[PDB]
């Protein structure tokens, strides 16, 4: 992927996560826990909604008949119509194939971007108190209780509070 988060350094997705698109799994003393990130999930969904609102519509233009279902029309004007209509159908088939293909490529990469954007938010928040394992996890070099985890997720984690404990644990 363009951003290497989804189908990238993150080895796979979580069938278990059914309350959101992007979220966290932690492991501390207390045990294990899973929680969805709302803001990042809504960001992706809102962008896809946007596409759907634009793509799912027809034009206002009223078209009348130029081909009688129940009677022959002049052979020459009929051939002109056939040529024109076939030429238009070729365009719209192409324009449709391109639109969907191009949107699909973007929808995917957009979602990738939103995952990477969350990871980078967390990375910068944890500052010098954790290290990347390269599978999309941060090894936290201090005691991180469930309140400390909820603080990472809720963007309230103050790195300075654990800095001294963490830098010691890291240098060993």
């Amino acid at each position: 992927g363009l951003f290497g988060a989804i189908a990238g350094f993150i080895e796979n997705g979580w069938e278990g996560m059914v309350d959101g698109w992007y979220g966290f799994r932690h492991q501390n003393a207390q045990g294990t826990g899973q929680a969805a990130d709302y803001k990042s999930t809504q960001a992706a969904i809102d962008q896809i909604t946007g596409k759907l609102n634009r793509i799912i519509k027809k034009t206002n233009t009223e078209f009348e008949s130029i081909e009688s279902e129940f009677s022959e029309i002049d052979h020459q004007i009929g051939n002109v119509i056939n040529w024109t209509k076939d030429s238009i159908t070729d365009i719209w088939t192409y324009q449709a194939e391109l639109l969907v293909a191009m949107e699909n490529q973007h929808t995917i990469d957009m979602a990738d971007s939103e995952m990477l954007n969350l990871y980078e938010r967390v990375r910068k928040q944890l500052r010098q108190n954790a290290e990347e394992d390269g599978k999309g996890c941060f090894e936290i070099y201090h005691a991180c209780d469930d309140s400390c985890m909820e603080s990472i997720r809720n963007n309230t984690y103050d790195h300075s509070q654990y800095r001294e404990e963490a830098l010691l644990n890291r240098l060993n």
């Binding site: 997705g13 698109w21 449709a96 490529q105 954790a130």
Partner: protein
Amino acid sequence: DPDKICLGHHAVANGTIVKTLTNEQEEVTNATETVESTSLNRLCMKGRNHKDLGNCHPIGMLIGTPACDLHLTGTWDTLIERKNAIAYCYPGATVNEEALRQKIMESGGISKINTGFTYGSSINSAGTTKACMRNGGNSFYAELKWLVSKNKGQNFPQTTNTYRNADTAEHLIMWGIHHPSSTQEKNDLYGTQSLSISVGSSTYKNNFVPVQVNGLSSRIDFHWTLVQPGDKITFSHNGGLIAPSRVSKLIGRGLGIQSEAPIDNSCESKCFWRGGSINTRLPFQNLSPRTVGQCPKYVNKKSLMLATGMRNVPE
């Protein structure tokens, strides 16, 4: 040994395949269809002032074939023609037939206006036939008169009838010309004389000379023209003319549907084709390239799936 927090994304057991610029087989969490393959087998005429013609052919409305009696007049926004609809109770055709049909099917209604045409007592106006039945008894086109000599064999009096368009909008005048097969029939009805029929306005001018279907080689062929506001049209004939008792006026505009499918006043739609209605909110369809109204564009595609979710990576 150390505590750890992991970032991740959802997945699903059953993902859908879509196409991208780079990958023909890309599995994603959710997609949706963009091409409509399903069609409703009915004509959705809710909130439309429609007229189902049934066995009446639109041209039959202007000349008034028995079948079209209920449809000689009215107002609409939608006009539905049917298969094998009847225009001609007496054998014949209209020159420029298709051009006229299309004109009527663009119309949003029909006014009728009396020509006021009167004839000498040597003429029979109410000439009827067994072909055009009305009230289970011999009749004729409601908007035309069959002009024949009152005394069988007598030469037909030279007549001149003239319609003027008093209205502020153009009027559609039609008339017929009877051509019998046998000279015994022509002499019996119009007389031995050479027959000549001249029609003329500011716009139009034409001359006509009377030259086996339902056991008859005899025809009544129809002609038409638009007569402008303020202008007049004059008919000179020595017999053989089927004369307009009324002219037609086409009012406003209307959507013309050709469909074998039945009406339904419960359901609404802005797109129609031979096989019925199309109410899909989708931007494309693959049902038919021949559609009328506000419509999804015809594409040569069974399906085009639009990703509505991220890449699906299970396990």
